[PDB]
Amino acid sequence: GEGMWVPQQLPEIAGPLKKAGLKLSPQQISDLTGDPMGAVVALGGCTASFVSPNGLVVTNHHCAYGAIQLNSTAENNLIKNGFNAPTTADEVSAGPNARVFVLDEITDVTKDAKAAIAAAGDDALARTKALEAFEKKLIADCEAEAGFRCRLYSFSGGNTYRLFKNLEIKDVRLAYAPPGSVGKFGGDIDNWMWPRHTGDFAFYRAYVGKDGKPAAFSKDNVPYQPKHWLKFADQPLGAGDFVMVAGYPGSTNRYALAAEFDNTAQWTYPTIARHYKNQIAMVEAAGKQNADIQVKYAATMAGWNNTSKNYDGQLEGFKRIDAAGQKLREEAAVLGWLKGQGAKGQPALDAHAKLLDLLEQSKATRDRDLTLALFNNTAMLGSATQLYRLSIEREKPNAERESGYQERDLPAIEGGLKQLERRYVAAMDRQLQEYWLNEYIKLPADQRVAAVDAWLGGNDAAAVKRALDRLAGTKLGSTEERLKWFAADRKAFEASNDPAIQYAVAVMPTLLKLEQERKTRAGENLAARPVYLQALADYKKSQGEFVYPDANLSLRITFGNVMGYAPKDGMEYTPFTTLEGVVAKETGQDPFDSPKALLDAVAAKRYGGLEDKRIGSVPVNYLSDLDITGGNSGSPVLDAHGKLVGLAFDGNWESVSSNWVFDPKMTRMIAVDGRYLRWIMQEVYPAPQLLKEMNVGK
Amino acid sequence: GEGMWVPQQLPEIAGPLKKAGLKLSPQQISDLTGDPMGAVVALGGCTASFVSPNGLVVTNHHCAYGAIQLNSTAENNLIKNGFNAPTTADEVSAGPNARVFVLDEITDVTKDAKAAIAAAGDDALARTKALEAFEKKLIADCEAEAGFRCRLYSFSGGNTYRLFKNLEIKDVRLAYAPPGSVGKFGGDIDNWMWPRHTGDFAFYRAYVGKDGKPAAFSKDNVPYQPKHWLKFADQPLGAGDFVMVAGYPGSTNRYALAAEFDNTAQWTYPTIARHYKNQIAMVEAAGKQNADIQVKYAATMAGWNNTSKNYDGQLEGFKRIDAAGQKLREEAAVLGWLKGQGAKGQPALDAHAKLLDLLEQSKATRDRDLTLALFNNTAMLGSATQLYRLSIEREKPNAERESGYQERDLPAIEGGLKQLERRYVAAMDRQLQEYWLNEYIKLPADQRVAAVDAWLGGNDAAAVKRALDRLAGTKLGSTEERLKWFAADRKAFEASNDPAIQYAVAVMPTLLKLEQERKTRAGENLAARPVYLQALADYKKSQGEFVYPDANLSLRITFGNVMGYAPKDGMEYTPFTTLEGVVAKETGQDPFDSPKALLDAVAAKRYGGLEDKRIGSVPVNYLSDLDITGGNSGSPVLDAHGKLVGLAFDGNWESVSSNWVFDPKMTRMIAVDGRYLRWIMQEVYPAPQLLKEMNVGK
Ligand SMILES: [Zn+2]
Ligand SMILES: [Zn+2]
Ligand SMILES: [Zn+2]
């Protein structure tokens, strides 16, 4: 059911865990470096887990997709055919940006963080800067030992701070991927849908140097030896059984003010969806003409289609459950309860009023700020502004540089500058520049930016067309020229005639002022959010309820049971799909073109010892009332005993309004059953040596 | 499961009956005039049943629709509002044509029927004439007792004959009908559909004279006092429970030869569906520009549209289960098994080959036969041919008149000629004449009819115009003129210069010849069909299977269990719907506009003591694997103890092939739960006097 629990609080919900069917102790699963949770690793946007003592890792197929594609050629197309490395020497590099993060140490630093913050006083901007300086020093000390990357997380609006130290593994290799018509069966048609029949898995192996320390790719590297790895369930997973997921959910907003919900539902989501559908259409149209565009902008357009449809999907969800009235009523209950407290309820009511004040301030400039951020996020302007800003930060001592522009960030910046070549074509980027400038000049007069108005020299189509002609002269389209600017001094930026640079130099004082205004507001938030969130927690507790923090990229556990749902009277989604359902969907055409070996194996009922008699077949995917969101792709599903029964890979469409509210009736995770992994690797695209490594050989 | 069993054979399926959960003895339910099967009555078209010892009858709302309409005005709309009679003196006549038939006596006449047929020797036409004569005198002698109507039914190709003598009750009155948004909730949108939420029921009362004998409506009549009547269940109906239906299915063709079925699927269905769509388009377009056309041809066009959709639906459903291949393989198994026997198998193989040959004969003239039938069934041509044929049959004595033209048929004939006024406009009939003459002039020369060619005088567009212009002069438009011809003698027909009667005189010798050809073939089928069906039954017995005759309007029992179905992997239709499901569909516009007392009672959860806790609500409708077809509307559904738990009113769209096949996975009957009858009558449109009469209220 609902809840993204921090592992440290699982002992306080022993009652619900046990009732749902947990057989390990709460204490055992609260150990973030223990068995099983110490097997869970972060890939940087997806979850994965160790599944052998020789560093084999399992995750979703769409999580490995970049690595599979990276190693594919026209005549050896691994996306379509699959990949298998029968020995560890056959494994292929997932590329210099691939990472496995293994948790080494967690520290609660809440006391020192709150002291660093209090020492700043009444000044909001200085509160933000104190916390920045606190965080930077923490990270720098923690990372002084090579091989580790550290992160500071704020929980519950700044009620709690914890510091995570992770081993940063940098040699990650592909070991297995099923054919793409397994890993992505149903493609975009089945996305967010149940019934689901998708074998969404792939395997990596993690490598380090012979000295046991992380290293970049080298033939001299050997597999990492994890301290904990998951084992396949020996018990067949059935309807009603306990399941739990561990992983790194990104962001939820379950505790937001009602007017914060309203502003999102009424403005943010429709504005963004509209813009993204506009951009999607121009890219789709242009890509039909020019296959270079289509290739290079495909990941980009897919990103847009995702968010755009998630937001149409949340919008729709909000209507179905009347999210607006639900928030207003809940907040009315909380505010009435606080009035009923003393004197001692006042600080939280003042905090509430302040948060509404901050929201009003952000709203006054919201068109200006979004349109300017997205204009500047086009490829050449994003690059020029980012490179000029780095040049400005390089004049400061490293400890004072902005996050994102410190020494420790340089490789990721250099990496981004190269990677841009894979997703940039001038004629397309000009069309996006154009769109955004057209949106800009449509802004009301009080939403404008003086620097941009001066640079344009007017507020009409003619000024737009002049600006595009001016900008077309940039050289920042070559990787080689971007890397020159990466190394360049700010005087060089400020003397340049490159028109993308001159735009950056012209706007940057403005960007810094808007940044400083964001940070002032954030400093106020830092004072008021935690006070309000604590009162929410006390209110919930007075009503008998447990509380969990909104997602914030750190490790969480969610639990529940395997179960379908009923979207209307007279019908039910059943909790499992089966092999024969995969074959009923076959059309012989992408995306419903299963490998022949799969069709043959199902026609023959080669169940390979894996069938569950209760469903009459080998299960494919299953539903459960777990609570996940972006970031949880590739999370292991564990049973009551902490054994692997699945990977998370999606949710139902009704789930996506989850971010704001959690609808217990309808919200379900979709997982791929561990038996289906085993079945594919036995009967369809075989990997007997991996199954042997995981002690599930025939 | 599959089977439309005659009651006499139930003892021989004691095993399967008991296994499905029947608790009465098969012997008890085998008695057609017994408890409970004697309570089941025929309305003509529809099934109903007695539910009190004072003649109360329950059937479907759509079975009672004609009576509700008859008793409605513009100002008092019983269709919309419902009807309730608080005392029996309030009940209103269903009109002079309304009938309840109650079985009085059944006699097996197989021996005498087969003797009459055998006396004709090897003369095929004389075999047909011998059965006709046997039937006509058996029915006349049975019916010489006033008050009774008799039918002779042939079973299994003529392997068995039974005579049914029914009490013919003629004073039938409406006692209760729920409001139309209950009786037909979801209208044509929810036709054939599950989930379903329709309260498809209504009540009549049957009346007889004070002497106990049938009589037409009179205020001196009293309620009929049935020998047997049904009681409401007292055990709550749940999923998996035994249910059985008793009713009068019209016709099935489950044992059609492979080639017969192939001809129907490949030629008959697509060809009729084509003509029907063309006629539909012609009436749609004409009705726009008229409104008399539009109103008078609505039902006709509906009926075409229905058959058209059902034929297309059956073709798709045939492909979905490979009906043709299953039939070919079972037929092959039969022929194999006969072939292995000696001489012993030869008669049945010979009869098979004879049935193939008769199919070939009818195939040779299929185009001509269909075109000529449908040309002659246009309204004026239909009227003229029928009336002239009647005049020919008159002037034989009644005992020799072809059935459909005897004295006992003259009320249905008179009926037809008046009713025609409801559905005839000359401008439209002309177009339908035109369509069919244009079909006709496409016939090959060897498919032509000389007498039609002569009358046409030509074979091109101008011939057809002359003919239509000619036919337009008829006077058979007017109901009064048709009634003249209905009483005129053969000689008046043959002098008349009414152009439609002239057409009929010209074509009638040909029609008669063709009738004689059909009867010759029917005579050959008399001899070959039962011999093949007997071999079919013998083969089946060798396989451990029981065989039921095709439906033929006699009383049949089907049995099985309440269960849903899964049309695809990952989902299920559940066996019941609930009250809350009704309200979730509310839009309040027709046809999703429930009465307000319904919305209010569901919102208050006034379940009236009727809720089944296993579903959390009062049941509305439910699914089961019973085998029904047209004729079964209104059939009572009984539980393991022979107590009433619902009425059959529809099937899922997978039932649309009930003539040809049963699919045990998908075919389901849809019934209204007797608890929903009761709930409506308690909480929504109250009828406390009927509930008390049925011993389920005070
Ligand atoms: Zn530990
Ligand atoms: Zn800063
Ligand atoms: Zn005859």
> A374 and A230 share a domain?
no
| Whole-angstrom distance, CA of residue B28 vs CA of residue B32 | 9
Cβ-in-10-Å burial (0-12, 13-18, 19+) of A72 comes to middle
Q: Could you write out the DSSP letters of every residue in B299-342?
A: HHHHHHHHHHHHHHHHHHHHHHHTHHHHHHHHHHHHHHHHHTS-
Q: What is the CA radius of gyration of chain A?
A: 26
| Whole-angstrom distance, CA of residue B611 vs CA of residue B679 | 9
Q: Could you write out the DSSP letters of every residue in B524-549?
A: HHHHHHHHHHHHHHHHHHHTT----P
Other C-beta atoms within 10 Å of A9: how many? 17
B569: which chain A residues are within 8 Å (Cβ-Cβ)?
A: 195, 197, 577-578, 580-581, 584
> A237 and A302 share a domain?
no
> B529 and B576 share a domain?
no
* Pairing assessment for the beta strands B571-573 and A556-561 based on DSSP bridges: unpaired
Of the three residues A549, A565, A591, the one that is the final residue of a domain is A549
First-last CA distance in chain A? 36
> A505 and A600 share a domain?
no
A512 CA distance to ligand 2 centroid (A)? 10
* B211 catalytic residue (yes or no): no
Query: CA B453 → CA A98, B363, B378, B459, B535, distances in Å?
Result: 86, 22, 18, 8, 45
Asked if B125 contacts B117 with a C-beta cutoff of 8 angstroms, the reply is: no
Experiment type: X-ray
SS3 A296: helix
Q: Are A574 and B573 inside 8 Å of each other by CB?
A: no
| Whole-angstrom distance, CA of residue A348 vs CA of residue B482 | 91
Compare CB distances from A569 to B566, B572, B581 and report the shortest one's residue.
Answer: B581
The one-letter amino acid at B336: G
Q: Using CA coordinates, name the residue in chain A closest to B578.
A: A569
> A511 and A391 share a domain?
yes
Domain membership of residue A264 as a residue range: 253-549
Q: Are B196 and A570 inside 8 Å of each other by CB?
A: yes
* Residue bearing tokens 């308690």: B682
Asked if B647 contacts B58 with a C-beta cutoff of 8 angstroms, the reply is: yes
Report the candidate in B180, B184, B200, B203 with the shortest Cα–Cα distance to residue B43. Answer: B203
Of the three residues A549, A575, A595, the one that is the final residue of a domain is A549
Q: Are A570 and B573 inside 8 Å of each other by CB?
A: yes
Q: B633, B635, B655, B657: which is the annotated catalytic residue?
A: B633
∠ at Cα A57 (A304, A102), nearest 5°?
85
* Residue bearing tokens 């004629």: A427
Asked if A622 contacts A577 with a C-beta cutoff of 8 angstroms, the reply is: yes
| Whole-angstrom distance, CA of residue B141 vs CA of residue B120 | 22
Helix axes B426-440 and B379-393, enclosed angle (nearest 10): 80
Count the residues in chain A. Answer: 698
Q: Are A196 and B584 inside 8 Å of each other by CB?
A: no
> B281 and B248 share a domain?
no
The one-letter amino acid at A380: M
Q: Are A572 and B571 inside 8 Å of each other by CB?
A: yes
Is B192 labelled a binding residue?
yes
Q: Are A195 and B566 inside 8 Å of each other by CB?
A: no
A32 CA distance to ligand 1 centroid (A)? 7
Compare CB distances from B571 to A197, A569, A574 and report the shortest one's residue.
Answer: A574
Other C-beta atoms within 10 Å of B299: how many? 11
Query: CA B656 → CA B47, B551, B660, B676, distances in Å?
Result: 19, 16, 9, 26
Asked if B186 contacts B196 with a C-beta cutoff of 8 angstroms, the reply is: yes
Return the beta strands (E) in A136-201 as ranges.
Answer: 148-155, 160-169, 171-177
Compare CB distances from A572 to B574, B577, B584 and report the shortest one's residue.
Answer: B574
Q: Are A570 and B580 inside 8 Å of each other by CB?
A: no
Report the candidate in A169, A184, A183, A199 with the shortest Cα–Cα distance to residue A93. Answer: A169
Q: Using CA coordinates, name the residue in chain A closest to B569.
A: A581
Q: Using CA coordinates, name the residue in chain A closest to B622.
A: A570
B403 CA distance to ligand 3 centroid (A)? 7
Asked if A517 contacts A124 with a C-beta cutoff of 8 angstroms, the reply is: no
Q: Is the peptide bond before A26 cis (omega within 30 degrees of 0)?
A: no
Residue A650 bridge partners (DSSP):
A670
B572: which chain A residues are within 8 Å (Cβ-Cβ)?
A: 571-574
Compare CB distances from B195 to A194, A197, A568 and report the shortest one's residue.
Answer: A568
A576: which chain B residues are within 8 Å (Cβ-Cβ)?
A: 570
SS3 B584: helix
| Whole-angstrom distance, CA of residue A45 vs CA of residue A64 | 11
B165 CA distance to ligand 3 centroid (A)? 23
| Whole-angstrom distance, CA of residue B580 vs CA of residue A697 | 51
Q: Are B195 and A571 inside 8 Å of each other by CB?
A: yes
| Whole-angstrom distance, CA of residue B544 vs CA of residue B560 | 19
A401 CA distance to ligand 2 centroid (A)? 8
Q: Using CA coordinates, name the residue in chain A closest to B572.
A: A572
B20 CA distance to ligand 3 centroid (A)? 45
Q: Are B570 and A580 inside 8 Å of each other by CB?
A: no
| Whole-angstrom distance, CA of residue A290 vs CA of residue A310 | 28
Catalytic residues of A: 62, 200, 633
Is A191 labelled a binding residue?
yes
Burial code (b: 16+ CB inside 10 Å, e: under 16) for A622-660 equals bbbbbbbbbbbbbbbbbbbebbbbbbbbbbbbbbbbbbb
| Whole-angstrom distance, CA of residue B140 vs CA of residue A339 | 93
Is A322 labelled a binding residue?
no
**CA A626 to chain CA centroid, nearest Å:** 17
| Full strand arrangement of the beta sheet holding A576-578 | A556-561, A242-247, A636-638, A644-651, A669-673, A619-624, A576-578
| Whole-angstrom distance, CA of residue B687 vs CA of residue B689 | 5
Residues B551, B553, B559, B562, CA torsion sign: positive
Is A632 labelled a binding residue?
yes
Is A674 labelled a binding residue?
no
Q: Could you write out the DSSP letters of every residue in B80-101?
A: HH-EE-SSGGG-EE--TT--EE
Instruction: Indicate which ligand has the atom closest to the C-alpha of A136.
Output: 2
Residues A551, A557, A559, A562, CA torsion sign: positive
| Whole-angstrom distance, CA of residue B248 vs CA of residue B554 | 5
Report the candidate in B269, B250, B260, B252 with the shortest Cα–Cα distance to residue B313. Answer: B269
Is B459 labelled a binding residue?
no
Residues B507, B512, B516, B521, CA torsion sign: positive
- Determine the distance in angstroms separating the CA of A626 from the nearest CA of chain B, rounded to an integer: 18
Encoding tokens for residue B229? 């009547």
Burial code (b: 16+ CB inside 10 Å, e: under 16) for A438-463 equals ebbbebeeebbbebbeebbeeeeeeb
Residue A165 bridge partners (DSSP):
A105, A150
Q: B171, B200, B593, B673: which is the annotated catalytic residue?
A: B200
Of the three residues A500, A521, A549, the one that is the final residue of a domain is A549
Encoding tokens for residue A148? 């580790």
Compare CB distances from A580 to B196, B197, B569 and report the shortest one's residue.
Answer: B569
3-state per-residue secondary structure call for A319-368: HHCCHHHHHHHHHHHHHHHHHHCCHHHHHHHHHHHHHHHHHHHHHHCHHH
* Residue bearing tokens 């009681």: B231
SS3 A207: strand
B578: which chain A residues are within 8 Å (Cβ-Cβ)?
A: 569
**CA A475 to chain CA centroid, nearest Å:** 33
Query: CA B75 → CA B174, B175, B181, B202, B595, distances in Å?
Result: 19, 20, 18, 22, 19
Most A CBs within 10 A among B185, B565, B571, hence the mutation to make, goes to B571
B406 CA distance to ligand 3 centroid (A)? 12
Run of H or E including A138: helix A124-142
Q: A660-663: long-range contacts at Cβ-Cβ below 8 A with a sequence spacing of 24 or more?
A: A660/A253, A660/A254, A660/A256, A660/A261, A660/A264, A660/A314, A660/A318, A660/A323, A660/A327, A661/A254, A661/A321, A661/A323, A661/A326, A661/A327, A662/A2, A662/A254, A662/A627, A663/A317, A663/A321
Is A679 labelled a binding residue?
no
> A101 and A221 share a domain?
yes
Encoding tokens for residue B290? 């008229």
Residue B8: what are its φ and ψ, rounded to 5°? -60, -25
- Determine the distance in angstroms separating the CA of B670 from the nearest CA of chain A, rounded to an integer: 12
Asked if B429 contacts B380 with a C-beta cutoff of 8 angstroms, the reply is: yes
Provide the H-helix boundaries in B71-209: 78-81, 110-118, 124-143, 180-183
Number of domains into which chain A is organized = 2
Q: How many CA atoms lie within 13 A of A672 on its CB side?
A: 26
Encoding tokens for residue B87? 């005392």
> B275 and B285 share a domain?
yes
| Whole-angstrom distance, CA of residue A378 vs CA of residue A386 | 12
* Residue bearing tokens 């369809």: A684
> A536 and A633 share a domain?
no
A509 CA distance to ligand 2 centroid (A)? 14
- What residues of chain A have any CB closer than 8 angstroms to a CB in chain B? 194-197, 566, 568-574, 576-578, 580-581, 584
- Determine the distance in angstroms separating the CA of B567 from the nearest CA of chain A, rounded to an integer: 11
Report the candidate in B238, B247, B197, B235 with the shortest Cα–Cα distance to residue B562. Answer: B238
Is B191 labelled a binding residue?
yes
| Whole-angstrom distance, CA of residue A326 vs CA of residue A419 | 44
First-last CA distance in chain B? 38
| Whole-angstrom distance, CA of residue A403 vs CA of residue A136 | 8
B673: which chain A residues are within 8 Å (Cβ-Cβ)?
A: none
Most B CBs within 10 A among A320, A568, A569, A586, hence the mutation to make, goes to A569
Q: Could you write out the DSSP letters of every residue in B400-446?
A: GSPTTSSGGGHHHHHHHHHHGGGG--HHHHHHHHHHHHHHHTTS-GG
Q: Could you write out the DSSP letters of every residue in A473-497?
A: T-STTSHHHHHHHHT--HHHHHH--
Compare CB distances from B569 to A195, A570, A572 and report the shortest one's residue.
Answer: A195
Name every residue whose Cβ is closer than 8 Å to that of residue A31 and which is 6 or more positions away in sequence. Answer: A7, A37, A38
Instruction: Indicate which ligand has the atom closest to the C-alpha of A27.
Output: 1
* Pairing assessment for the beta strands B83-84 and B160-169 based on DSSP bridges: unpaired
> B324 and B372 share a domain?
yes
B396 CA distance to ligand 3 centroid (A)? 13
> A544 and A510 share a domain?
yes
> A374 and A297 share a domain?
yes
